[PDB]
Design a protein around this ligand. Sequence first.
Ligand SMILES: [Zn+2]
Length: 86
Amino acid sequence: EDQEQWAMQTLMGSGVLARCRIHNDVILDSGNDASSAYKLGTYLYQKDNSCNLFNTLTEARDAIKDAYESYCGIDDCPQCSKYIDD
Ligand SMILES: [Zn+2]
């Protein structure tokens, strides 16, 4: 398992993104307030780490920005569209 993926749990679970009940390891783009997601991400990731260049929030933003941009272009899991929905 991946840690960064664990973050997505709550971060993304904040309702920012969309996930399939059959796919908990999948990320779908919703187009909701990402700002909130980012905050939620930093919140879970670690308390207020607001410090000098030392700590860079860009990492987190890139984490979600990466995952988001990674799955970006998908508003619905193709699996369900590639399979039958019991
Ligand atoms: Zn699905």
